[PDB]
Design a protein around this ligand. Structure first.
Ligand SMILES: [Mg+2]
Ligand SMILES: [Zn+2]
Ligand SMILES: [Zn+2]
Lengths: 93, 113, 1083, 78, 284, 326
DNA sequence: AAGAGATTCCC
RNA sequence: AUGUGUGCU
DNA sequence: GGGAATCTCTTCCAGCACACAT
């Protein structure tokens, strides 16, 4: 099983909506620095060798455990296309 | 025009035939056995099709990326990689008109009907 | 060791030489044995005088023939890509119409492959073999009319494919229709060709069924002697009426189209012994004075009326009665092709008469070397009928020779007609195994010959039957044909007998192929032994009567892939054939004559023949099998010992002291274990690895060619142009790597270059191992082929020994296939109260659903076997039974338990608990003593077992014992792929190649459909381009991951932009409109 | 009409171009400017674009996700 | 009637050196060759003289030659001089056929990052995961492992790391641990032999197990009909994070616990499981 | 266990039922090794009444046979007579097998397998202890002499031979159709790939009434439709107009779970509703596609079908997979 | 190669 | 790169 | 104008393998 998927599949209209959401989140989370995460202080995914999942092992794990909390919001039309891309590379390294 | 939606198929006039063409294959020449460079304005010439090399031209007045969308003054070589070669068409101006056998040989004669 | 047989049916005759169908056929097929004046007209010789006296001034004649000294020996052919053939000489003279007789004996008009004493012909440097065929025996037959159950139709089959297909049908109207080629016509006209008068005909046919009216007539139509020809031609061959028909006569005559099956053999014996009475010549043409004569046509008509009327002695032919189906043996296939070649040779000699200069022209102007060549050449190398000799072990090879096929030259069997033909017909009893047929698709079309069964020249299988005198069984063995078997009443071999006299009031018998229980008198014959029903592989299965037919199939088809194990064991429970198997299969080497031992070397055994002769024997250690296994002979007698004639001297690749050893005798406990024996997967002791129980020896042959290209002559040198001396530490010879070295995936095997970049030969991603032999065929080659352009080849024999690992395929004789799952160490393995662990763990859930109780029984006997140290011989249906096995078990128990009872130990607390539970189970009887309870359990093959990893006893007794288990020819390392990014092809960007990577896995419509079904558009698209044929994006991803960034998707689909270009090539225009109809750039 | 007689004549000529005789599928549609509504799967798969279903469905494909830290920064200049 | 003949781009017709100096030229080059040989022989011909036989026969020759380029085979069969009696794969043939540009992507295409092996029970692992041998894991995840090896004190940079994994005895603890650090939540696709229904391919999370064969969970056997007696299963890796996302959500085994055919659990207890359970819940 | 998993699925969830599953997979194994369930030669306990069930058969046929020789019945008639004789004999012996266990040997290693969902099959267990029935002749007929023995005891030479006839046919029936696996799925996919659920709801209100009564068992006798069929013609679907029955009102346009169908059948047993109104792809509006309400449930689970599912492909495959089993 | 469809010829 | 053949699924 | 016959074109199946041959 995966981190509380029944909450997820229900959190959206179509099950594929969730896939696209998780995906694009992981993408912009990896591309614009792994710092625009919305749950990095204590409630954050971790690993086993050291505890170094705090940095950048998996991009999807983070998305799935991110949406679990009401920190983000999906939708069809929310932000103008170009502007989003630009300001997402501005506000982060 | 950024989102490809649907595709249509139709016959092409001489004009539209030549429109995708960037020059005429006026020779039956392929490649010299010695100089692997293209031959006499035939099938592989950089003038009609594209530069056999990457971003570099024929002679070598312009060689790098800085002048990306520029054509040389003395020889016409505008350059992307070995892709522009593989994406540009040439043509052949037949002496006497010839009909497309596709429309001739068929179960229903597209022209004989 | 030692042996105890149970079988009490006296095999009154030993089993015939197994590879005889391949050998005897070939020897009789040519007069190379006996002098060219001796007998044996048939085979090659026959083929001669069929197309030999080619009358025109052209009259050749058969003036003897001889050949048979090969270009190169048995093993040198195998190494140099040649054929163990012999040049064909054959003496040929010419006689002109006028005077003068010019002769020139030997003409190098081609070659002809010889056969090893085992039954294989080394063609094109590869051991190949031709199987036997089954088809309808060419003759006259009477089968019912398809749509009309009222009348019947005749039949005249004559092979080959060229040669008419004649049917005779009494058309419901009344008139009789001749069917030739396909067309029909009034048969009475052809009757008139042969010079029949209305009267004579009216007599002969008129005899009984008035139906003669149907044909006797045609007064206006049949009142002309030789005009019936002139008219038949008009109505059959739409053309000109001169003498062309008087010549087509010959075509429905002799020599040509109809069958040349000798005067007295096939056509004769078949015809007479079945129908009619007489045959006057191979086929139907006696033409004294141009006139015609016939003998078959009239009995065919006579028999037709007889059947389609009253009862002149029951006239019903059965299409697959087997007494109607010949078996084309190897020698027949060969001689047939030889005839085919001689035919075109004859066409040439006909053609050349017009290009003759003067008179003489015997040697050089006429007889050439192409038709015979084309005949004998394309056959052994292109025929669907000849294949790779399956040499997994000697037994498998033995099977592959004795197998019969239907699939053949097209003229007989097709690959689009089955389901009905494949089924076990009645007459296959004793002649063909109803079990051996290889499973899966194409099933039933391939059936091995039964054990005691053997071809009788005529083609039909013959069964050994013991005839009986009234009430006493005769010690006479008559080999009967299917057509003759049904004409009697035969008893089973299980029938109670006193010496040779029946001892039961009711005898189980079979009439015309059906169970009927009769009296001791009506017996006239008897089955020799129940071993005659099955093909030897099925005869290798103990307690066969206790296995399902489906299971026994696989069981009989498992041996055919039993990898020869370095330390192999003979079965602990066998049938008795093994010892014969190894000797008839030419596995090991036996003694030829009585005497003592001279020199037991690991390379030779010298023998003391009492006739002052010591003959030399090679013992051959590592000879790569055709399959990939290894063939080893290891000595078995010590220096200074007296041997006997026919006694072994060494062991074959699959023999232990002269028995068939195709695997191991491991102590198996049948019980569920964690999940490790889920399905048919098999748990295994680590112990078996510690004492190398399952270990093979494979030799992968690599190669390279030195083609002399013009841009730059390729050449082999001990020089690798670019980097390290470390890689050349193995390169000993100048170009060749050393022998005895260790090569690994990526190691350099051969060094050579071409136009200077390195194009050498390295070890593929699979595995190398240890080099054992290196062959090199230079330009100065003492008589070899060598491919065009190539200057010299370099082949390497890299051997390696592989142990039983997780993933290898394991199975038995009873038929249980199954992979190995986990190799639990010795500690945490089920072990008896005695310090003895178990070797293999089989899931019981695999037993009931397939009904193969055989394993259970071999295990039961295997218990007594393990504790008494003695194997057993249990024949097919006269093998062991319950009272016997239980009895022996009772004996072994005394050892297994008495040892403890004496030693100062007794009934363990655990044993007590297990017994207590076994009571409520209902295996033991309540009331006895613990020792007696354990005795009862030990009788049923069951016994207390400890968990091993806990020490808690498995609450419930389970059956343990030593069963026979082989390792199958499949392994894992043979099938292993794991490449991420590697070679592609210039011609196609789809990845494949074995340089440093294996090969990209195939993606079919069935996979794409699954990904599509899920809705994984990204994974699918990524699969169809990014990791396949799109090159632009391939390196995009490959660069991306290198830096640790996400895989970039492809913005512009590649296969689209290419197709646009391809579609614009023609007069077609591909316009990629926008959402609201506007042209959109793609580039 | 049967399954195969049906599928043999889908308007999506991209499909029939694959299985059926290519030359006639292209010829018959070339004369009459046939707009291939790139809707069918097998249709849209020959090309290489993502497939018209699942994670590629129009209903889903065009979707965006952001957090408050960016939602605000965008909220300002809007 | 086209009076101008469009010529295909170069690389779509690769005049390419293969080996030893052997030149594979797509037959389209040899087809465009004679078209020019007759074209310029017709145009030049109108200039000098103008015989009806010569010129008209020439027109027929042209009309034939261009047809050869378009649809080869409708009129005899143009062949390269005695050596190959094959007709040249014309433009019409570069499409229609099993190996074309319509049947192309639909059924073919050999994947890149992939493999296969013999199936074995995987008792000690859950539906979420599966047993995959070490060697496979290293090879399949070569590049990820490279980068992460650069992230740690395992290798200087990319190239030196590529040279690190070159020979088979170089694989040290460092590399393996890093290799576990590259996967984690990463999921792989496992394919069956004849794949038939949707559940024919299941995603699992790789577990670096020894041995050599692929280890698979018992329950999903009945799913894509797999028995342990010598069968072969394949394996891929959804590289893109989008592909990873869809794979571990809709293609994962633990999330597909019902058959799309009918509302029946297709991961129910099976051969051994049931026997064990039934044995312990009955009365005496 | 299967039904338990199905219920716990739609009750406890998906990710949970996974864990339940693996718990079963663990414990069941671990216990199956402690049980000691094995297969011995004695384990296949032969029924006690064998000799009598045969005796009363033999002493029966002996009479019937005579009736032929006297000239009472015809050829065909006695052929069918022996048929009925052994047809009933084997079936009766089977009961002796399955009862001998249940009575005297409750925990029979061969019994517990065939009983629970483990390997094993009724008529198969009949073959090990009881006797094999009459086998098939090469043609469509049957041998008038059945294999009167069992695999446990010695199955005789000739008997094996007469069983081989059907035994080989089996292979053809399965192996000749291992290749047909790619044929039906192919044909169906070609006409379906265009279909995908890419809609929320359509503007139509057309339905079908899936009948709850099979009219055609005997001549013309109306009666309850099969326990199975109804379930697959009503599960996870959508109504077109509210229908109240047993005492609870079913919502309009409601995604019926299995229990909905259950209580519906119960209500139909009393004489309430003969049919049920339902949305189906058969009557959608979407040209290329099918909407959400029209399709229904299935999404590898019991959820409303997601918007954008590749339904056509899935359906084609689900009709294709068990094609070869025919 | 075998089956189906289309075209041509004869009634 | 296609055909023949066998082996396994 | 219709019907029958003959010729031509198209379909030609689940996966891997090992082989050989052209
Ligand atoms: Mg299998
Ligand atoms: Zn320049
Ligand atoms: Zn709808």
């Amino acid at each position: 099983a995966e981190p509380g998927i029944d909450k997820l599949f229900g959190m959206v209209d179509s099950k594929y909506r969730l896939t696209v959401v998780v995906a694009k989140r992981a993408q912009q989370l990896l591309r614009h620095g792994f710092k625009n995460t919305v749950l990095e202080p204590e409630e954050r995914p971790k690993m086993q060798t050291l505890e170094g999942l705090f940095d950048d092992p998996n991009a999807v794990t983070w998305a799935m455990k991110e949406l679990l909390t009401g920190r983000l919001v999906f939708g069809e039309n929310l932000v103008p296309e170009d502007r989003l891309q630009k300001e997402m590379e501005r506000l982060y390294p | 025009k950024k989102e490809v939606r649907k595709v249509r198929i139709a016959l092409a006039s001489p004009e539209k035939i030549r429109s995708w063409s960037y020059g005429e294959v006026e020779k039956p020449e392929t490649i010299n056995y010695r100089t692997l460079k293209p031959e006499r304005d035939g099938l592989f010439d950089e003038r009609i099709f594209g530069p056999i090399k990457d971003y570099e031209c024929a002679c070598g007045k312009y060689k790098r990326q800085r002048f990306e969308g520029k054509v040389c003054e003395r020889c016409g070589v505008e350059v992307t990689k070995s892709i522009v070669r593989r994406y540009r068409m040439g043509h052949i101006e037949l002496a006497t008109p010839a009909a497309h056998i596709w429309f001739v040989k068929d179960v229903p004669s597209k022209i004989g009907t | 060791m030692e042996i105890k047989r149970f079988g009490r049916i006296r095999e009154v005759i030993p089993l015939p030489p197994l590879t005889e169908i391949q050998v005897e056929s070939y020897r009789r097929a040519l007069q190379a044995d006996v002098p060219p004046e001796k007998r044996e007209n048939v085979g090659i010789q026959a083929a001669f005088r069929e197309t030999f006296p080619i009358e025109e001034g052209l009259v050749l004649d058969f003036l003897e023939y001889r050949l048979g000294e090969p270009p190169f020996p048995q093993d040198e052919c195998r190494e140099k890509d040649l054929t163990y053939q012999a040049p064909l000489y054959a003496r040929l003279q010419l006689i002109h119409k006028d005077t003068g007789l010019i002769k020139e004996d030997e003409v190098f008009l081609g070659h002809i492959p010889l056969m090893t004493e085992d039954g294989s012909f080394i063609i094109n440097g590869a051991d190949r073999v031709i199987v036997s065929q089954i088809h309808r025996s060419p003759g006259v037959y009477f089968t019912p009319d398809p749509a009309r159950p009222g009348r019947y139709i005749a039949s005249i089959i004559p092979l080959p494919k060229r040669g008419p297909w004649i049917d005779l049908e009494v058309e419901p109207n009344g008139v009789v229709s001749m069917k030739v080629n396909k067309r029909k016509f009034p048969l009475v006209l052809l009757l008139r060709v042969l010079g029949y008068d209305q009267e004579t005909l009216a007599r002969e046919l008129g005899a009984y069924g008035e139906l003669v009216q149907g044909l006797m007539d045609e007064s206006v139509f049949a009142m002309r002697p030789e005009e019936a020809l002139i008219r038949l031609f008009t109505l059959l061959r739409p053309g000109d009426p001169p003498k062309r028909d008087k010549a087509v006569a010959y075509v429905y005559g002799l020599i040509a189209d109809p069958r040349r099956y000798d005067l007295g053999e096939a056509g004769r014996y078949k015809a007479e012994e079945k129908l009619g009475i007489r045959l006057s010549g191979r086929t139907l043409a006696r033409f004294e004075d141009g006139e015609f004569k016939d003998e078959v046509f009239l009995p065919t008509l006579r028999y037709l009326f007889a059947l389609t009327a009253g009862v002149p002695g029951h006239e019903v032919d059965d299409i697959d009665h087997l007494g109607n189906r010949r078996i084309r043996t190897v020698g027949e296939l060969m001689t047939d092709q030889f005839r085919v070649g001689l035919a075109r040779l004859a066409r040439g000699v006909r053609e050349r008469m017009l290009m003759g200069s003067e008179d003489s022209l015997t040697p050089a102007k006429l007889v050439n070397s192409r038709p015979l060549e084309a005949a004998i050449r394309e056959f052994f190398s292109r025929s669907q009928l000849s294949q790779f000799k399956d040499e997994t072990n000697p037994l498998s090879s033995l099977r592959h020779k004795r197998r019969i096929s239907a699939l053949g030259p097209g003229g007989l069997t097709r690959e689009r007609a089955g389901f009905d033909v494949r089924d076990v017909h009645r007459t296959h009893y004793g002649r063909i195994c109803p079990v051996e047929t290889p499973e899966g698709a194409n099933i039933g079309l391939i059936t091995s010959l039964a054990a005691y069964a053997r071809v009788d020249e005529l083609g039909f299988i013959r069964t050994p039957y013991r005839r009986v005198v009234g009430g006493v069984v005769t010690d006479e063995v008559v080999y009967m044909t299917a057509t003759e078997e049904d004409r009697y009443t035969i008893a089973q071999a299980n029938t109670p007998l006193e010496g040779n006299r029946i001892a039961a009031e009711r005898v189980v018998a079979r009439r015309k192929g059906e169970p009927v229980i009769v009296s001791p008198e009506e017996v006239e014959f008897m089955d020799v032994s129940p071993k005659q029903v099955f093909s030897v592989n099925t005869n290798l299965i103990p307690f066969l009567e206790h296995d399902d037919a489906n299971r026994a199939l696989m069981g009989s088809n498992m041996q055919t892939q039993a990898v020869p194990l370095i330390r192999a064991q003979a079965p602990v429970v066998m049938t008795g054939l093994e010892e014969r198997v190894v000797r008839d299969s030419l596995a090991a080497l036996y003694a030829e004559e009585d005497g003592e031992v001279a020199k037991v070397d690991g390379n030779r055994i010298v023998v003391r023949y009492e006739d002052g002769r010591l003959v030399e024997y090679p013992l051959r250690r590592f000879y790569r099998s055709n399959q990939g296994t290894a063939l080893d002979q290891r000595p078995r007698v010590v220096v200074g010992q007296r041997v006997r004639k026919g006694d072994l001297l060494a062991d074959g690749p699959a023999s232990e002291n002269g028995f068939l050893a195709l695997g191991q005798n491991v102590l198996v406990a049948i019980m569920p274990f964690d999940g490790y024996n889920f399905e048919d997967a098999i748990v295994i002791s680590e112990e078996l690895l510690k004492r190398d129980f399952y270990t093979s020896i494979h030799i992968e042959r690599y190669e390279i060619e030195a083609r002399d290209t013009k841009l730059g002559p390729e050449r082999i040198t001990r020089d690798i142009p670019h980097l390290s001396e470390a890689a050349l530490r193995d390169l000993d010879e100048e170009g060749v790597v050393r022998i005895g070295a260790e090569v690994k995936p990526g190691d350099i095997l051969v060094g050579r270059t071409s136009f200077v970049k390195d194009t050498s030969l390295r070890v593929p991603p699979g595995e190398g191992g240890i080099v054992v032999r290196t062959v090199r065929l230079r330009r100065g080659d003492p008589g070899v082929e060598l491919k065009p352009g190539v200057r010299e080849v370099v082949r390497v024999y890299v051997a390696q020994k592989r142990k039983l690992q997780v993933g290898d395929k394991l199975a038995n004789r009873h038929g249980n296939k199954g992979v190995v799952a986990k190799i639990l160490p010795v500690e945490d393995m089920p072990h008896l109260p005695d310090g003895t662990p178990v070797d293999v763990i089989l899931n019981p859930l695999g037993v009931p659903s397939r009904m193969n109780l055989g394993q259970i029984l071999e295990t039961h006997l295997g218990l007594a076997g393990y504790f008494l140290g003695q194997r057993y011989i249990s024949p097919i249906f006269d093998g062991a039974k319950e009272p016997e096995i239980k009895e022996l078990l009772a004996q072994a128990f005394e050892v297994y338990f008495g040892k403890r009872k004496g030693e100062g130990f007794g009934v363990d607390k655990r044993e007590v608990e297990v017994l207590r539970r076994a009571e409520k189970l209902g295996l033991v009887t309540p009331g006895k003593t613990p020792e007696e309870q354990l005795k009862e359990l030990f009788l049923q093959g069951k016994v207390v077992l400890y968990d091993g990893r806990t020490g808690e006893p498995i609450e419930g007794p389970i059956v343990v014992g030593q069963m026979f288990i082989m390792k199958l020819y499949h392994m894992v390392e043979d099938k292993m792929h794991a490449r991420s990014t590697g070679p592609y092809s210039l011609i196609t960007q789809q990845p494949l190649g074995g340089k440093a990577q294996f090969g990209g896995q195939r993606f079919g419509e069935m996979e794409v459909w699954a990904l599509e079904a899920y809705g994984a558009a990204h994974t699918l698209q990524e699969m169809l381009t990014l990791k396949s044929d799109d090159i632009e994006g391939r390196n995009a991803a490959y660069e991306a991951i290198i830096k640790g960034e996400d895989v970039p998707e492809p913005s512009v689909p590649e296969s689209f932009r290419v197709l646009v270009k391809e579609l614009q090539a023609l007069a077609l225009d591909v316009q990629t409109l926008d959402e609201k109809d506007n042209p959109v750039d793609i580039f | 009409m049967g399954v195969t007689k049906s599928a043999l004549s889908t308007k999506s000529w991209l499909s029939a171009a694959s299985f059926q005789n290519t030359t006639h599928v292209l010829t018959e549609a070339a004369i009459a400017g046939k707009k291939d509504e790139l809707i069918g799967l097998k249709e849209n798969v020959i090309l290489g674009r993502l497939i018209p279903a699942g994670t590629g469905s129009d209903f889903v494909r065009f979707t965006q996700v952001v957090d408050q830290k960016t939602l605000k920064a965008i909220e300002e200049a809007r | 009637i086209l009076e101008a003949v469009p010529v295909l781009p170069p690389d779509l017709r690769p005049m390419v050196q293969v080996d030893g100096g052997r030149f594979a030229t797509s037959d389209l080059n040899d087809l465009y060759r004679r078209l020019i040989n007759r074209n310029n022989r017709l145009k030049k011909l109108l200039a000098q003289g103008a015989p009806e036989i010569i010129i008209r026969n020439e027109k027929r020759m042209l009309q034939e030659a261009v047809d050869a380029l378009l649809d080869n085979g409708r009129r005899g069969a143009p062949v390269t001089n005695p050596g190959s009696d094959r007709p040249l794969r014309s433009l019409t043939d570069i499409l229609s056929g099993k190996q074309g540009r319509f049947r192309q992507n639909l059924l073919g295409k050999r994947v890149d990052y992939s493999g296969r092996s013999v199936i074995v029970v995987g008792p000690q692992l859950k539906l979420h995961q599966c047993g995959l041998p070490k060697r496979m894991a290293l090879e399949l995840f070569k590049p990820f492992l490279l980068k992460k090896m650069e992230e740690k004190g395992i290798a200087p940079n990319v190239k030196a790391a590529r040279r690190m994994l070159e020979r088979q005895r170089d694989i040290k603890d460092e590399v393996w641990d890093a290799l576990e650090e590259v996967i984690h939540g990463k999921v792989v696709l496992l394919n069956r032999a004849p794949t038939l229904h949707r559940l024919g391919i299941q995603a699992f999370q790789p577990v670096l197990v020894e041995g050599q064969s692929i280890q698979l969970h018992p329950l999903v056997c009945e799913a894509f009909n797999a028995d342990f007696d010598g069968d072969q299963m394949a394996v891929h890796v959804p590289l893109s994070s989008f592909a990873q996302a869809e794979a571990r959500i809709q293609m994962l085994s633990a999330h597909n616990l019902l058959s799309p055919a009918s509302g029946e659990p297709l991961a129910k207890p099976s051969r051994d499981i049931i026997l064990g359970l039934y044995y312990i819940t009955q009365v005496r | 266990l299967k039904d338990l998993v199905y219920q716990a699925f739609l009750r406890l969830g998906m990710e949970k039922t996974a864990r339940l599953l693996d718990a079963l997979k663990y414990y069941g194994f671990t216990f199956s090794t402690t049980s000691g369930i094995t297969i011995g030669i004695d384990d296949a306990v032969i029924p006690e009444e064998k000799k009598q069930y045969l005796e009363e058969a033999d002493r029966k046929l002996l009479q019937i046979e005579q009736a032929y020789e006297m000239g009472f019945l015809t050829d065909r008639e006695r052929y069918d007579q022996i048929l009925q004789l052994w047809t009933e004999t084997t079936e009766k012996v089977t009961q002796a097998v399955f009862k001998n266990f249940e009575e005297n040997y409750p925990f029979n290693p061969l019994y517990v397998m065939a009983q629970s969902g483990a390997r094993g099959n009724p008529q198969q267990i009949r073959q090990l202890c009881g006797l094999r029935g009459l086998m098939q002749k090469p043609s469509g007929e049957t041998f008038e002499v059945p294999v009167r023995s069992s695999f446990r005891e010695g199955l005789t030479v000739l008997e094996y031979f007469i069983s081989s006839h059907g035994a080989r046919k089996g292979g053809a029936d399965t192996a000749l159709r291992t290749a047909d696996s790619g044929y039906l799925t192919r044909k169906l996919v070609d006409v379906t790939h265009e279909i995908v659920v890419r809609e929320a709801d359509c503007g139509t209100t057309n339905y079908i009434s899936v009948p709850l009564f099979q009219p055609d068992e005997v001549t013309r006798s109306l009666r309850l439709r099969k326990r199975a069929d109804i379930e697959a013609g009503l599960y996870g679907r959508v109504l077109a107009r509210e229908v109240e029955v047993l005492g609870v009102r079913l919502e309009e346009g409601r995604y019926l779970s299995m229990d909905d169908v259950h209580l519906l059948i119960k209500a139909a047993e009393a004489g309430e509703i003969q049919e049920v109104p339902v949305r189906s792809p058969l009557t959608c509006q979407t040209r290329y596609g099918v909407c959400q309400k029209c399709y229904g449930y299935d999404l590898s689970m019991a959820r409303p079908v997601s918007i954008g599912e590749a339904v056509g492909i899935v359906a084609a495959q689900s009709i294709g997979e068990p094609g070869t089993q025919l």
